Amino acid sequence: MNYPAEPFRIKSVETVSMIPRDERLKKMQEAGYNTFLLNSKDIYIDLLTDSGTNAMSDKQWAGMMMGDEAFAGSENFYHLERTVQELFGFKHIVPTHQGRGAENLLSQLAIKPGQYVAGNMYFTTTRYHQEKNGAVFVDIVRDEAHDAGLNIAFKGDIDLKKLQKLIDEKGAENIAYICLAVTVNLAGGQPVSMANMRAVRELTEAHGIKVFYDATRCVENAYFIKEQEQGFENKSIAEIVHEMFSYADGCTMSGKKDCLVNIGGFLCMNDDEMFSSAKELVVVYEGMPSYGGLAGRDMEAMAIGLREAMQYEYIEHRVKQVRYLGDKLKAAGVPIVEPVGGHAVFLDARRFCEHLTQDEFPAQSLAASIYVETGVRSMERGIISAGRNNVTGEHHRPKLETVRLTIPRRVYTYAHMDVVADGIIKLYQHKEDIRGLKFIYEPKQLRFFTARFDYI
Amino acid sequence: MNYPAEPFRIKSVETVSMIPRDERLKKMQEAGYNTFLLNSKDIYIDLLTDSGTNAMSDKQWAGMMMGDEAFAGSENFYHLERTVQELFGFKHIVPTHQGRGAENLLSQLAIKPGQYVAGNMYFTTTRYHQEKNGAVFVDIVRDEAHDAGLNIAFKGDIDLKKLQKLIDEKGAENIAYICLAVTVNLAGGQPVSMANMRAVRELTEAHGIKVFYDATRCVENAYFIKEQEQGFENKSIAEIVHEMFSYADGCTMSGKKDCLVNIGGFLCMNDDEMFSSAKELVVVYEGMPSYGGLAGRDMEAMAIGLREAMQYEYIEHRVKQVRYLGDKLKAAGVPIVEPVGGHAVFLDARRFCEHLTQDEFPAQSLAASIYVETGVRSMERGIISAGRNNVTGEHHRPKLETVRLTIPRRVYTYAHMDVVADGIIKLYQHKEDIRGLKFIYEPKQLRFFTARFDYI
Amino acid sequence: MNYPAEPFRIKSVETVSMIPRDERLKKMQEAGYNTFLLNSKDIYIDLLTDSGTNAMSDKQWAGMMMGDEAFAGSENFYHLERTVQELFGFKHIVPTHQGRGAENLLSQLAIKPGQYVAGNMYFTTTRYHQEKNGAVFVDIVRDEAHDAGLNIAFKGDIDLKKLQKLIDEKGAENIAYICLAVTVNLAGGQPVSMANMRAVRELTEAHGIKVFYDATRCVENAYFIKEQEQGFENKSIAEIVHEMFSYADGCTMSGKKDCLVNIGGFLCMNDDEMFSSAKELVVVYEGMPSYGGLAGRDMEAMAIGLREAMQYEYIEHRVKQVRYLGDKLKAAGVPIVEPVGGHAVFLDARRFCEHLTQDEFPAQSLAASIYVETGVRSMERGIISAGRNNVTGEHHRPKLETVRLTIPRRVYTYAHMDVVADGIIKLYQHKEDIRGLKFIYEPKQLRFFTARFDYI
Amino acid sequence: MNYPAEPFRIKSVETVSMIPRDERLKKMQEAGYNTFLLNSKDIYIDLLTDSGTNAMSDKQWAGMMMGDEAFAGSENFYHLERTVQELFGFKHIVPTHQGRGAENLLSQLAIKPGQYVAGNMYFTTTRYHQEKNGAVFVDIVRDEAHDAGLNIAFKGDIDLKKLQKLIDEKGAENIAYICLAVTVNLAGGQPVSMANMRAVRELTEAHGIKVFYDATRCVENAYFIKEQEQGFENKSIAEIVHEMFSYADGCTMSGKKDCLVNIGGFLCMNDDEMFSSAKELVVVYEGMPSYGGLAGRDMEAMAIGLREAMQYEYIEHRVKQVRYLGDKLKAAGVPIVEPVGGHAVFLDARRFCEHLTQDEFPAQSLAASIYVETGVRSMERGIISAGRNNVTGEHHRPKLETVRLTIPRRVYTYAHMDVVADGIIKLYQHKEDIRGLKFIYEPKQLRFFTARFDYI
Numbered sequence A, B, C, D: 001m002n003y004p005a006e007p008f009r010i011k012s013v014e015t016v017s018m019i020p021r022d023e024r025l026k027k028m029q030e031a032g033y034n035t036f037l038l039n040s041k042d043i044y045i046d047l048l049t050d051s052g053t054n055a056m057s058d059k060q061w062a063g064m065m066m067g068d069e070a071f072a073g074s075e076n077f078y079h080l081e082r083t084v085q086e087l088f089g090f091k092h093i094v095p096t097h098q099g100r101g102a103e104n105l106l107s108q109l110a111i112k113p114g115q116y117v118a119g120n121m122y123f124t125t126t127r128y129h130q131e132k133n134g135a136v137f138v139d140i141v142r143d144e145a146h147d148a149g150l151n152i153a154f155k156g157d158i159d160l161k162k163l164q165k166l167i168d169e170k171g172a173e174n175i176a177y178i179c180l181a182v183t184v185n186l187a188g189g190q191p192v193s194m195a196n197m198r199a200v201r202e203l204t205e206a207h208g209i210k211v212f213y214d215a216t217r218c219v220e221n222a223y224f225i226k227e228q229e230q231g232f233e234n235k236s237i238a239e240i241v242h243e244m245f246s247y248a249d250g251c252t253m254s255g256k257k258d259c260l261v262n263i264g265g266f267l268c269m270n271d272d273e274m275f276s277s278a279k280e281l282v283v284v285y286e287g288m289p290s291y292g293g294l295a296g297r298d299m300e301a302m303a304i305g306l307r308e309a310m311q312y313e314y315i316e317h318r319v320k321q322v323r324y325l326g327d328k329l330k331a332a333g334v335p336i337v338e339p340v341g342g343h344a345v346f347l348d349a350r351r352f353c354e355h356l357t358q359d360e361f362p363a364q365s366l367a368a369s370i371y372v373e374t375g376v377r378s379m380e381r382g383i384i385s386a387g388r389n390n391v392t393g394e395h396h397r398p399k400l401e402t403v404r405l406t407i408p409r410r411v412y413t414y415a416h417m418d419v420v421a422d423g424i425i426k427l428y429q430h431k432e433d434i435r436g437l438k439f440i441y442e443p444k445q446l447r448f449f450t451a452r453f454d455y456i
């Protein structure tokens, strides 16, 4: 069915409300035109991010009451460890408080200064941890991924030709690892095919190169494979997920996404020495290998949530609800990234605001504008997020200048999607009303989080 | 909006199975085609009743952690007490575990054997307690309420002329009280007007007669007054609620309906001496005046929920959600009781299954078909629920042969309403295929709960 | 060991505090010298009752998050039903919101007007439901049970000679049933031996008389059997519990005691017809046979709690903590009921206040006095509770005029017990300071709950 | 009181197994006689650490249901913010997932390579982050702190003469900051006086040097000031806390200690520019300025818990409970570090097991014996935790060969303290029977976590 109903009931609710346009206007100014700086109670439907904003189930809340809070040997850790071993198939697990905790560990463990890390497009925290540790990032995604309007399947795939080139021009020993993300967040939540995962494994293995996945949205990815990759139609999400990771040497994971929790993450690997070193390091930044900066109750919620994510009807509905928002927007002629990805609809800021150049930050501006007319919060995913080149000092110039309508799992309904789509269509009517922005405060890294702007 | 979006978002979800049609058919058979005998774990959308099946808020769940479990003098009781005094404007309140507990107390307190209790139709528990305490029931609802097709506003209103007639024929002193229900469940959830409540108060007061309300769905009732009664456009739900009860000497309430909880109710009154007698009685059946057979956490959740029920956007959506399901069914020509009430849609199974005789249990069979085709549980409200005649062994044969689609508050979405509507509308496009049922097991009493059937 | 440590850890806490003596004095006056009328937040350690005041475990709180709130077919009901079948061994179960709900059902089901019900001492609600339904109560406990200071084992036992006499003088057909309580609350929480249960079964069976247990404190009872009855020392609590009920035709149960919950109860029986009739009746007073006036989450907590009660270390500690309070009091010469029972220490009001007669209510007075000097709340269990004879109109005159220090399960520590014992010993120092009381308001039944007094 | 009763009662309990000695011996062996390798489910009383193992209140659990899970601008953050501003009096606050996260930020913000950080002894994570950022550590604690038997008040005080010496020898500009810990964990949980904090503030301020506090057990510290520092008799815990931090430029805190939570911490500072830099850094390691790697519910629980920690009766009992265990051990002649600290009792295993050499791991073996005999887990803080020398392969051989009995807040009773004390005192009456241990598995790093032993 095109748009299935929620494969669950509502157990408990929280109120939503909208403050007037004029109140929202004061608010957008006081946040320095950065949606990141608005306050939760001032937001009606909050599509800033699907990170940590998911609704847990009654089963997970039951596990929340059974937190075994021991510093060492918590039953919750054993339950997480066993679940991840079973479902992802890696030998070892190190819990971390969230994803960038596990990225800090991997980057410190796996990178020698001056080595290359090659990935299917960059992510902000991931790239920063690679570069802080002295790696050079190389984008090996296909060119097509960078074209917003181009509707092709598995836009997340690595270009094997580009991978071959890197191996030829630099030498295998100078490549720390391949970073393969599932889905690809900045491409619009685009999936990677199993075929691509296999071919990447085969080539890297022949040269002795390691492959570490970013598992953050691996279930959404597995959904796309089931739906769209020939041969996978009668496979279960869990089977698909276990095969995906069989082509990897380990993974980083933010549980705050596809594990259906509000906090939590982990690092997995197969290598014993790397496991031993990872435990030496987790102690510095996170906590004991037996809790990694998480309460026992959160290891428990995350163990239960990751297994709930395997239910076909859950993930089908998750992905199709996002698709519904995109379909409504597209039917009205609103320009979006296509095809719609697993977790968000990305409005194409370049087309929405054809009158601005990327230098007056159309994407930051539109996000503000949607808040002002709508009370819906959305996120900048363009030139601001891309940050500065640390060799030249200029803005990285992404081809994708996008505004992200990001959907938390199990929180909103199709009627909420309708409210969002209506507000956005009206704003489209007068797209030309959206003004250029300029920096008034710029952080030294990850600048999009707390940067502040003024109109040009 | 004809249909506003949910004025809340989802905090937590309730896991459901999603079993396919073929398994649902096995479950229905194991249940002897009686939806009352289905296991909850086997049902996707459970529309058996809106009683005690509501989703609580995060604030209510917070209060669930603050239960003061004292047997006497719990802080949660004082919170419940002042909330009800504030919102309903009654002087005194006695908590009960649910509605029929309050009804038990009222009927023992307020009836002398042989006296009459007149009301706008009746509900089974309410009327049961009236009769077992010696009252004669007299229906004083307007005749229009008995016409299930008549699309008229405030169909729950008492006919003042019938009340006048009762006064003149039996004498004021032989009338124990008037029992005014808001809304009227038996008529399909039909609201009573403020004008009618005032007229009833004025006539009864001149004769010294008491009026007690069944407040169970008073908040749905208040929404209808707000939406449709000239002059109440500028009034809040709370103002309407407080005015409604100013025309009463007291009430009984099942909190499991409009107080947005899973258990709880209470008895209110203004008379000091009745309050005293009520407290003497509550200890025999329920508990102390300050717990009434409720945990402290539940008095707290009900205090919080009743106040949440006053929010305009909440009750508006609650009622418009039910209306959406009714509207969609009606647009497809599916026969329903009209107008659609505050809490449920009733299918006219006599008309739906015209090819079957009432002796083939059309409503019981339609309810079975609906579950098989959709995973939706509904309640038979026809000849089966009517029971078998005490003395002759004939069926009691009611005019209403209906299936009730009863909607718990804040549990389902419009997409779930589409599951229900689409399934029923498909069944209706080939209704003649629906098969008659026969008893294979019939208990001597409460046959609707445990009887088993097979297809003719 | 004499005084074992708690066989659990503290998971969560609530603050306790004490308001000054003068504030307590105003308070005791405004409650009309009835501890029942004080407010929970004005009480420092609340020993009014062990009914519904117990601390639940983390496992039960986990079940509280998994309430299946369906009106029919709740998984929680199936879990309760199965647990009670397994542990108590009765065929059928009907949930009720609490104990007196199940007593209302049994008394209506099993008593013909003018029949006798014979019991091992009376309880207030139990006796009232017997008499409301037209039974005459006969006390068949041994004489020894009525002597407070007499330290003998299994003071709860029925006098078989007294039972034989009743059978001889009235005829078996005029005895509705034998009511056998475990433990015996008003005797001081006194256990009944297995031998006595067997002999009672054997004699009643030969005459065709039914035996229904009051199961409210059956686990405490089972503890005493394990500890003190020869042959039972190597049996498990669960084994002992299952044998106890094998000598009964059914039971009433307040779950609010030994099932470790804050609300809940049930009625059990073996007879099919009586089960069928009980379901007809529960619908009138409580709710459906599938929930009996309980939320699904409470059926779940009660199923889990009853099974936790079977843990030997739990019940051993439960009973020995009470014994510790009694041992400290006795070592200081404070007069108590002996031996100390399962749930409470009962101060002997007659000996504490030798200067008053029972007619100036020493027990009500002392309870007030302990509150005033201590902030510890305790309960009257003497002449006030015993009520009036409904043939003569005079006070029932119990030989046991007692003040109950009642211990909620898993809430307090030995240090709390020490605070209680110290305060009470000091009050003993000046026992003569405690004044006579007289009624100023007397309820028509169960008068102790909300009766109000003034000093003579 | 020498030992007050608990100023709370139990709301809920945590289930524990209660396995007998013979099974405990098997568990210890399966754990290779290393208590760090025990499963939590196998332990009765877990005194491994007071970090993150505290029992929350009912109010905290209520706040756990009110988590506003927004990625930015959560209401729970603003609550945490204003609570810390109010209670600590720092201008700015950045949340972190726990203490070492705050330490990571501080040391990156406040240290230039080659600079000195001087402090009253150190803690391992704290000093680690100082060194890895280029600092040289200098101990400026009073010499008395190094004498574990010396029974002296405020043993945590900095020696102003050592600080003066450092200033004159290295120059103020080469001192990054002074790190003042309250209490001092390494000295046995020894408190610092207000006089010392003021003297340190005055000297450092004259030279332009910053002072940052490790606030982890500041509330235990404040209790000692209240109890023992002349002039603080009339001051509340809150007044003492606020005055303490007025002598600092900021702090790092592990909320998992004195904020009564299971996870959480924060970084405070007064300097506007450092606050700005801190927010730029927090996003790399932890999360947004308004969540810092914490769920919203946890910022809420920590806001509520920190305020609960200010209650006099609570902290008084917390500290006197630890003191009770120390007093009892000392009265029996069991050798301990003196005076007993705010959070733990340390057994002198060198003296306890005089018959063993440090090479036979007396503390590791005593910790094993304690578990076997009582079901109590303790932490080795001796030669094993000291590690093996980087370059020579010799053991690092510490002066302190101790077993730490670390007490989580609000989890245990005096009866549990008796289990611990009685078990240790019995072991001590035949200490010579305690056997030396030898390595059977030794990892290359963090050997205390995973090493395995057998008896010599």
Ligand SMILES: CC1=C(O)/C(=C\N=C(/Cc2ccc(O)c(F)c2)C(=O)O)C(COP(=O)(O)O)=CN1
Pocket: A048, A049, A050, A051, A098, A099, A100, A101, A123, A124, A125, A126, A181, A185, A214, A216, A217, A254, A255, A256, A265, A379, A385
């Ligand atoms: C594919 C991947 C992610 O999407 C991701 C996080 N995602 C966020 C939160 C956030 C992160 C970076 C931003 O520029 C951003 F604006 C928002 C998000 O909204 O998308 C992390 C890191 O996981 P942590 O957030 O648990 O540390 C690793 N890998």
Ligand SMILES: CC1=C(O)/C(=C\N=C(/Cc2ccc(O)c(F)c2)C(=O)O)C(COP(=O)(O)O)=CN1
Pocket: B048, B049, B050, B051, B098, B099, B100, B101, B123, B124, B125, B126, B181, B185, B214, B216, B217, B253, B254, B255, B256, B265
């Ligand atoms: C207007 C009114 C009610 O609707 C009502 C209950 N209503 C139910 C539950 C129900 C009750 C009895 C049945 O045979 C039945 F088949 C359905 C329902 O589905 O509609 C009560 C009684 O409130 P209690 O249920 O809290 O005691 C009082 N007044």
Ligand SMILES: CC1=C(O)/C(=C\N=C(/Cc2ccc(O)c(F)c2)C(=O)O)C(COP(=O)(O)O)=CN1
Pocket: C048, C049, C050, C051, C098, C099, C100, C101, C123, C124, C125, C126, C181, C185, C214, C216, C217, C254, C255, C256, C265, C379, C385
């Ligand atoms: C052996 C037995 C009980 O002890 C009992 C209750 N006990 C109470 C509460 C209460 C009851 C009667 C009083 O006079 C009294 F002052 C207090 C108590 O404190 O002891 C019930 C009834 O169970 P319900 O309370 O769940 O309905 C049945 N049987």
Ligand SMILES: CC1=C(O)/C(=C\N=C(/Cc2ccc(O)c(F)c2)C(=O)O)C(COP(=O)(O)O)=CN1
Pocket: D048, D049, D050, D051, D098, D099, D100, D101, D123, D124, D125, D126, D181, D185, D214, D216, D217, D253, D254, D255, D256, D265
């Ligand atoms: C005075 C201070 C602490 O005591 C402390 C922690 N303390 C622990 C846990 C622990 C930590 C590391 C170990 O190798 C260890 F064996 C024990 C403890 O048991 O005492 C931290 C760090 O706070 P985080 O743990 O929230 O990051 C900062 N400052």
Ligand SMILES: [K+]
Pocket: A069, A070, A071, A294, A295, A296, D051, D052, D053, D262, D263
């Ligand atoms: K923890």
Ligand SMILES: [K+]
Pocket: B069, B070, B071, B294, B295, B296, C051, C052, C053, C262, C263
């Ligand atoms: K209670």
Ligand SMILES: [K+]
Pocket: B051, B052, B053, B262, B263, C069, C070, C071, C294, C295, C296
């Ligand atoms: K319910």
Ligand SMILES: [K+]
Pocket: A051, A052, A053, A262, A263, D069, D070, D071, D294, D295, D296
């Ligand atoms: K979150």
